[PDB]
Design goal:
2 copies of one chain form a homodimer.
Chain A: E1 2-4, H1 5-12, H2 16-24, E2 40-42, H3 43-52
Antiparallel strand pairs in A: 1-2
Amino acid sequence: MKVNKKRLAEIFNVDPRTIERWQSQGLPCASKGSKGIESVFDTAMAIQWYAQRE
Amino acid sequence: MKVNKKRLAEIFNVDPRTIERWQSQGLPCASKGSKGIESVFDTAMAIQWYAQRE
């Protein structure tokens, strides 16, 4: 499902800054947050990403 | 974060049925539902488990 960074961080039980670390590592964010609009992530997509690194 | 079977299924973008099958393969439940009270899953616990599958 589509969530923002806050919810995404709340789902993975990590700090936002850790979520942003992952973003530098290629975790895709479906739509980059531009100018008063937040970045929106796909949760299954993020989970697939987390799962590949191991 | 604490979620119900429906919410967890939406996060993985899978059927509620899939969550039940994963529970049978060792996906941990923070609170097993029984009657009308409903199951509680831990999303972090869920993601670490899934990520240890492959």
